[PDB]
Amino acid sequence: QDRMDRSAVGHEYQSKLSKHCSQVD
Amino acid sequence: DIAALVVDNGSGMCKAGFAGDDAPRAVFPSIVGRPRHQGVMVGMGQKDSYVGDEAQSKRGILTLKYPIEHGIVTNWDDMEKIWHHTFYNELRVAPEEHPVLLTEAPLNPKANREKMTQIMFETFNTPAMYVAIQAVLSLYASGRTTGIVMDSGDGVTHTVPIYEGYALPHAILRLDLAGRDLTDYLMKILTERGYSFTTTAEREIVRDIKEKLCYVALDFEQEMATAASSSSLEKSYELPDGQVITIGNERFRCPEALFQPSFLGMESCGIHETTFNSIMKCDVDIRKDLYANTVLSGGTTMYPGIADRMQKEITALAPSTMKIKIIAPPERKYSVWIGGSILASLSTFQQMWISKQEYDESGPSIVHRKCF
Amino acid sequence: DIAALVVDNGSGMCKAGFAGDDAPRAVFPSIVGRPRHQGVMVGMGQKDSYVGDEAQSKRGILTLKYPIEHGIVTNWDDMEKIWHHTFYNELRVAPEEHPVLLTEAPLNPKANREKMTQIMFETFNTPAMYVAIQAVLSLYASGRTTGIVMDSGDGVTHTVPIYEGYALPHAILRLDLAGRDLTDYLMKILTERGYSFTTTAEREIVRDIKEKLCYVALDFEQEMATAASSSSLEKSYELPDGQVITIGNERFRCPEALFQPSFLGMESCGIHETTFNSIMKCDVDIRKDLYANTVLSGGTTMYPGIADRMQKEITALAPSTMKIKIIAPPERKYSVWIGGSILASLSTFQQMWISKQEYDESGPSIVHRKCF
Amino acid sequence: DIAALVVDNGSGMCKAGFAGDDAPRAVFPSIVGRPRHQGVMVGMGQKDSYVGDEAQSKRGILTLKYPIEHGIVTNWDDMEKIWHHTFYNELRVAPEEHPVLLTEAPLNPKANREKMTQIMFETFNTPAMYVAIQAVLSLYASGRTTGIVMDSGDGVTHTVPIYEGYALPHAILRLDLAGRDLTDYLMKILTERGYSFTTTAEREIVRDIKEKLCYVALDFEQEMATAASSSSLEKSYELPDGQVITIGNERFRCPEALFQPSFLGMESCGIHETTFNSIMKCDVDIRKDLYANTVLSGGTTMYPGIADRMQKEITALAPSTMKIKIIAPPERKYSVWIGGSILASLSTFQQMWISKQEYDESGPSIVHRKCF
Amino acid sequence: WXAXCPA
Amino acid sequence: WXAXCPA
Amino acid sequence: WXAXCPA
Ligand SMILES: Nc1ncnc2c1ncn2[C@@H]1O[C@H](COP(=O)(O)OP(=O)(O)O)[C@@H](O)[C@H]1O
Ligand SMILES: Nc1ncnc2c1ncn2[C@@H]1O[C@H](COP(=O)(O)OP(=O)(O)O)[C@@H](O)[C@H]1O
Ligand SMILES: Nc1ncnc2c1ncn2[C@@H]1O[C@H](COP(=O)(O)OP(=O)(O)O)[C@@H](O)[C@H]1O
Ligand SMILES: [Mg+2]
Ligand SMILES: [Mg+2]
Ligand SMILES: [Mg+2]
């Protein structure tokens, strides 16, 4: 520990799949 | 009741354990030490070669040799010793009763996998085995199915982009530049102060100096002026014999070779450009998800300041409207093993083993069809 | 209790709903997505094919194909999956409980509606069905009974004149130029700026830029001179990667291909001359009312400024004594389905459904007799 | 006396010469080398500049950069040097006394040829100039006037059909898979043997290995089987240092990508399917003659046994009654330039020249008016 | 290129 | 289509 | 390695 950074996000976090306007209608 | 063994065997450090655990059972440097003196106190535990930790505790009188350089096993007699020590002395389990999930770097010669399988089936006589790409297990462990893994082990640094579980093998990049090159570059730049480390038993002292003191500067051209103006950046280290060294500027010039490989006399681009190019090799649609799910792994990425600098680089490189998030957990020193233990425990995996019957039918050439 | 199912089944995009509503229940692109890579994380959503919206969001790792090409169903094994996804997923209603109103483009090959009916009965086991002309429904939905409909969807363009509700088959005009031909011409003309879209995943981005920035011009030469005089027509569009492309002159060069098919290497005349010849093919007495109820419909006619341009062209082609009215409904994207629903809700139409027992008498060829 | 120079300037290799000759006078690999090490001795030659064979010779200490990439000039500060070298150092003639006929692939950024004309008229002060498509030159180099030119350089591949001297722009096809992509794929697949090439210098070694020992198969699967079964299909190459390496299965796997781009992950169609599609986009009354007069050209179609493979493919795709003949002249490596010199010796092309004052009166855009 | 592909 | 045009 | 780099 102490090797985590200010701009580091734990693997526990999860984003959502990409959705661009080219994908709706 | 049989449980698979997850045995990493990457360059620099070998980590073995049972399938279904949260941490490797046994971690030890993957070295083999040959005694370079002729000792006559016979009967006191003399041997012909010391493997793993037993070599480090004796490295003073040994020549330490790594059987795996840049991800490739250059010596198979030594690798058989490493695996035997892993099976019978660290895990203390017969290999002929459990399946073995080994890992390999991408873009290695096919002879590596061929001989891995031949050894695991003809010498240790395992009932089943598998060979997995490390940067895929590093995503398994992160609890994801979409992201670009940036795995930087001791001897090799590779990037693999995956989206929704479908890997893009036309964008897998590899860079033979890792801890072992940073440690050999620190051994060179340390001479500017007057410190001369040359023995293979002092490469370990230099690797310890590097993994205890060195950090990655957020701005190299500014931290150079900082370390030039004042002595508020020096740190002292105590060798195992009493002498004390002090290193102020080398601290961030050691890992700076990752981002400017020209320091080592290499044409290749840094790790940030290696990741950016591997992102821009994919399709226009999935680049946004690859940007915001940039995973890190391997020991070489355990530098204080690596995530900040990587983000500052890949943000000045990516379009101004893309959000970059460097997924770097503190448990990334062993993400590949956790991914292996996750994969080996799954039920849908129990059909993906290479069974001993299969190997008896087609020889070692089978590992190319089954293993991705 | 039961209500008929109205499925537009148009080329490129599919619409569906229940008979007797003022809006289609579900609209989804007619795209069949198949993975072109080999997954490495098995058990995390592996499906042999993705259809509809799931084939739009995941287009980064899919090859996408259209079951209908120029109004003709080219892959029936894919049309079956599209129909199955329409029935069992978007509407979540069984086919054996409702009549189904398919729609077809005029002058389409003989086996098209035959196989449509065959699949409707032998696979889905629908009670009743019909195959209506895609164009005539638009005049129904428009709230009129005389006039010529200009239906330009994604795969086929056609001008059909109808008087008092009876269609004039002798004056039907068809043109293979469509919205997907404009997408392809944009994929060509965009290269002059320095952009390259060639992948089926990127054809979708090209289609999105088209229906967002391109617009028909009223005087093509004057707008060309405007663009060449001062750059005030350029617009910035952001791809899913975050690049900022900039199309200027290329705004109206794409829709202009409707009026001059010579840009696409085609010999036929534009849509305005097509409508003019179709009208002048109609009986002289009724022409007086035709020129007053020229209605645009379908997707591709939703271009900014297409109304004024069509009016100018057709009034410069037709004599000055005639009254030219280009009536453009502000919801013409679904007019075909609205008219299909209106027609299906009629008690008089409750006898025009080709029934199953009737299908058993003369085989699929029965569709050629009942449908006009 | 006074003649017209001809500077092909294709990707990879720049060709140049005088009109009338049957071979380009000066041909050299169009690269620019830059020293990546700091010189220390006095007496050493030029810095920041190494062009052509001079750069090829000393590539052991340089980083190499191709100013052209996929047919688009990426860095003009280097292309200007390339032109300066081919004018003053290879042809050894002042460029202010000769017209110059440059070449450009179809479907390229307009600003490319705009800057080409601007540099030709603003730096070297040529009296006149002209830019032509390479395909039109290739067909004009075969003496034919009715054929489909299949050209394939190092960065572009294009099929262009021409009938009775009239060019059909609607059917011009350009695939981006070309020679350098094959070189990269070879660099990637050679790692299976264990041969690592990652430097831009060793890329030249790989390219030479490719064009010396690689051959495209007639039946890919059969060749794969024979290679996997026996060793009678393994060749040996000698690296510059003196080592000897062996290439077997890779020999035909490398060029096979031209027919199956999926090997590179590029989800597109092969070059034979590209030819078939560019033919099927032409009028139905001329497809047979195009089927009869397919001509090849460029340094990427000299692989042994490529004509027969393309003929087999097209015959499999084309109708049975249509006869297929692959005209493969054994001088195609320079054919386009030959075409260039030819187009420069016609009294009919001595008026199509873009005059200096013609450039002054209208600016660089005149290239689009005069040149097609 | 500027958009699509590198060049 | 089968003849003339693709579909 | 065998050619290029050591390993
Ligand atoms: N905390 C750290 N800080 C800096 N460098 C490190 C750190 N941990 C490991 N390294 C470097 O990375 C290597 C260890 O990485 P490791 O994950 O053990 O490789 P592998 O998984 O291939 O065995 C060592 O060679 C060391 O130089
Ligand atoms: N404003 C617009 N500009 C250009 N094209 C459009 C516009 N609106 C719709 N389209 C195009 O028209 C087609 C949609 O027509 P539609 O009525 O759905 O017929 P289909 O069901 O055969 O696609 C698509 O190609 C779509 O991109
Ligand atoms: N006989 C050959 N077989 C295979 N490849 C070749 C042969 N000769 C040249 N090449 C390849 O063609 C590429 C470029 O040559 P060429 O296509 O003639 O350049 P240009 O595109 O300017 O015509 C080089 O990478 C070279 O290796
Ligand atoms: Mg590792
Ligand atoms: Mg429609
Ligand atoms: Mg060329």
Going by the DSSP 8-state scheme, the letter that residue C130 receives in this structure is E
Q: Is B288 strand, coil or helix?
A: helix
Q: What is the rounded CA–CA span in Å between residue C13 and residue C26? A: 11
| C-alpha angle B21-B27-B29 in degrees, rounded to nearest 5 | 155
What is the residue with the minimal CA distance to atom 15 of ligand 1? B299
First to last CA, chain E: 4
Identity (one letter) of the amino acid at B307? A
Greatest extent of chain A over all pairs of C-alpha atoms, in Å? 47
Helix (H, G, I), strand (E, B) or coil at C118: helix
Interatomic CA distance for residues D172 and D273, integer angstroms:
13
d(CA B10, CA D40): 41
Nearest to D339 by CA among D90, D102, D84: D102
- Residues with Cβ within 8 Å of D62's Cβ and at least 6 positions away in sequence, in order, are D33, D34, D35, D36, D50, D55, D201
**For ligand 2, what atom is nearest to the CA of residue C179?**
25
Shortest CA distance to D81 belongs to which of D123, D19, D128? D123
Other C-beta atoms lying within 10 Å of the C-beta of residue B355: 16
Query: Is residue C239 a contact partner of residue C327, using CB atoms and an 8 Å limit?
Result: no
Read off the tokens for D115: 């800057």
CA distance B170 to chain D (A): 6
Specify the DSSP element, H or E, that contains D259: none
Q: Is C99 in the pocket of ligand 2 (CB under 6 A)?
A: no
Residue A20 alpha carbon to ligand 2 centre in Å? 19
Ligand number nearest CA of C14 is 2
Residue C70 and residue C56: Cα distance in Å, rounded? 21
Q: To which H or E segment does residue B11 belong? A: none
Question: Which atom of ligand 3 is nearest the CA belonging to D152?
Answer: 17
Region label for D325, one of left (φ > 0), alpha (ψ between -120 and 50) or beta (otherwise): beta
Sign of the torsion formed by the C-alpha atoms of C360, C362, C365 and C366: negative
State the Cα angle at B46 between B45 and B48, rounded to 5°. 135
Taking the Cβ of residue C245 and every Cβ of chain E, the question of whether any pair is shorter than 8 Å is answered with yes
H helices of chain C, in order, are 54-57, 76-85, 110-122, 136-142, 179-189, 200-213, 220-229, 250-253, 271-280, 284-290, 306-317, 335-344, 356-362, 366-370
Which helix (H) or strand (E) segment holds residue B34: the answer is strand B32-35
Residues measured by CB to lie within 5 Å of ligand 5, the ion = C 10, 153
Go through chain C and tell me how many residues it has.
372
How many angstroms separate the CA atoms of B10 and D34, rounded? 37
Q: Do B354 and B130 form a contact (C-beta atoms < 8 A)?
A: yes
CA distance D368 to E6: 25
d(CA D130, CA D236): 45
Q: Which residues, at least 6 apart from D92, have a Cβ–Cβ distance to it below 8 Å?
A: none
Helices then strands, counting H and E runs in chain G, come out as 0, 0
What is the full DSSP assignment across B240-254? TTS-EEEESSHHHHT
Ligand 2 atom 24: residue of nearest CA: C154
Q: Do C324 and C316 touch, CB atoms closer than 8 A?
A: no
Query: Helix, strand or coil for residue C196?
Result: coil
Q: CA separation (Å) from D262 to B81, C38, D186, D258, D265?
A: 42, 12, 15, 10, 5
Interhelix angle B306-317/B271-280, nearest 10 degrees: 40
H or E, element range at B355: strand B354-355
G3 contacts in chain D (CB < 8 Å):
194-197, 239, 243, 245
Distance of CA B103 to the CA centre of its chain: 11
HSE of C225, CA atoms in CB hemisphere, 13 A: 4
Nearest protein CA to atom 26 of ligand 1, as residue = B179
CB of B201 closer than 8 Å to CB of B59: yes
User: Tokens 């036309």 correspond to what residue?
Assistant: B170
Query: Directed axis angle between helix C271-280 and helix C306-317, to 10°?
Result: 50
Tell me if C298 CB under 6 Å of ligand 2.
yes
Pair B28, B12: CB distance under 8 Å: no
Q: Are strands D294-297 and D326-327 parallel, antiparallel or unpaired?
A: parallel
**Distance (Å, rounded) from C-alpha B125 to C-alpha B87?**
12
Q: Which of D176, D180, D184, D268 to mutate to test the interface with E (most CBs of E within 10 A)?
A: D176
Beta carbons of C41 and B284 less than 8 Å apart: no
DSSP-assigned beta bridge partners for residue C65: C32
User: Which candidate, B66, B77, B75, places its Cα nearest to that of B32?
Assistant: B66
Q: Are strands B100-104 and B5-7 parallel, antiparallel or unpaired?
A: parallel
Q: Which of B96, B101, B94 is nearest to B24 (CA)?
A: B101
Write out the two tokens for C66: 């259209």
> Is the beta carbon of C335 within 6 A of some atom in ligand 2?
no
Tokens of D65: 């950069």
Name residues contacting ligand 3 (CB within 6 A).
Answer: D 10-13, 153-154, 179, 183, 207, 210-211, 298-300, 302-303, 333
**In terms of Cα–Cα distance, which of B266, B301, B295 is closest to B278?**
B295
Inter-chain touch G3–D198, beta carbons under 8 Å? no
Q: Which atom of ligand 3 is nearest to the CA of D255?
A: 4
Query: Is B218:B309 a contact under the CB 8 Å cutoff?
Result: yes
Angle (CA) B355-B356-B359 rounded to 5° is: 95
State the Cα–Cα distance between residues C293 and C139, nearest whole angstrom.
9
The residue whose C-alpha atom lies closest to atom 16 belonging to ligand 1 is B299
* Collapsed DSSP state (helix, strand, coil) of residue B24: coil
Structure tokens belonging to residue B334: 């062993």
Q: Give the residue among C117, C91, C103, C75 at the shortest CA–CA distance from C28.
A: C91
Q: In sequence order, what are the beta bridge partners of D31?
A: none
> Letter for the amino acid at C135?
A
State the amino acid at position D217 in one-letter form.
Answer: A
Q: Which of B60, B57, B5 is nearest to B29 (CA)?
A: B57
Mutate to test the pocket of ligand 3, among D104, D197, D211 (most ligand atoms within 8 A of CB): D211
| Beta-bridge partner residues of B5 | B18, B100
In this structure, the residue with its CA closest to atom 14 of ligand 2 is C299
The tokens for B117 are 């399988």
The dihedral formed by the CA atoms of B359, B364, B369 and B370, expressed in degrees to the nearest 10: 50
Report in angstroms the alpha-carbon separations of D109 from B17, C261, C265, D79, D340: 57, 24, 21, 16, 22
Mutation to probe ligand 3, out of D82, D254, D300 (largest number of atoms < 8 A from CB): D300
Measured in Å, residue C27 CA sits from the centre of ligand 5 at: 12
Round to whole Å and give the CA distance between B17 and B8.
9
Query: What atom of ligand 3 comes closest to residue D156's alpha carbon?
Result: 21
Between D134-141 and D335-343, two packed helices, what is the crossing angle to 10 degrees? 90
- Report chain F's C-alpha Rg in angstroms: 4
**Closest alpha carbon to D255 in D326, D179, D325:** D179
User: What beta strand segments (E) does D249-357 contain?
Assistant: 294-297, 326-327, 354-355
Between the CA of D10 and the centroid of ligand 6 the distance, in Å, is 4
Cβ atoms of B13 and B155 within 8 Å: the answer is no
Look at D36 and B268 and tell me if their CB atoms are within 8 Å.
no
Q: Could you give the angle at the alpha carbon of C270 between the alpha carbons of C269 and C272, nearest 5°?
A: 120
> Cα separation of C98 and C271, whole Å?
38
Neighbour tally for C123: CB within 10 Å: 12
For chain D, domains (ranges, CATH) are 3-134+336-372 (3.30.420.40), 135-176+270-335 (3.30.420.40), 177-268 (3.90.640.10)
Which residues are within 8 A (CB) of C319 and not within 5 positions of it... i.e. 6 or more apart? none
How was this entry determined?
cryo-EM
DSSP B184-221: HHHHHHGGGTT----STTTHHHHHHHHHHH----S-HH
Alpha-carbon dihedral C276, C278, C279, C284, rounded to 10 degrees: 130
Q: Could you report how far apart the first and last alpha carbons of chain C are, in Å?
A: 28
Question: Which one of C14, C15, C56 makes the best mutation probe of the A interface by having the most chain A beta carbons within 10 Å?
Answer: C56
Q: What is the number of residues in chain E?
A: 7
Q: Which of F1, F2, F4, F5 to mutate to test the interface with C (most CBs of C within 10 A)?
A: F1
Resolution in A: 3.3
Residues of B in contact with G5 (CB under 8 A): 70, 176
Query: Between the CA of residue C351 and those of B164, C3, C129, C345, D60, what are the distances in Å?
Result: 50, 14, 11, 12, 86
- For D234, other C-beta atoms within 10 Å of its C-beta total 13
> With an 8 Å Cβ cutoff, are C74 and F7 in contact?
yes
Q: Which two tokens stand for residue C291?
A: 């020129």
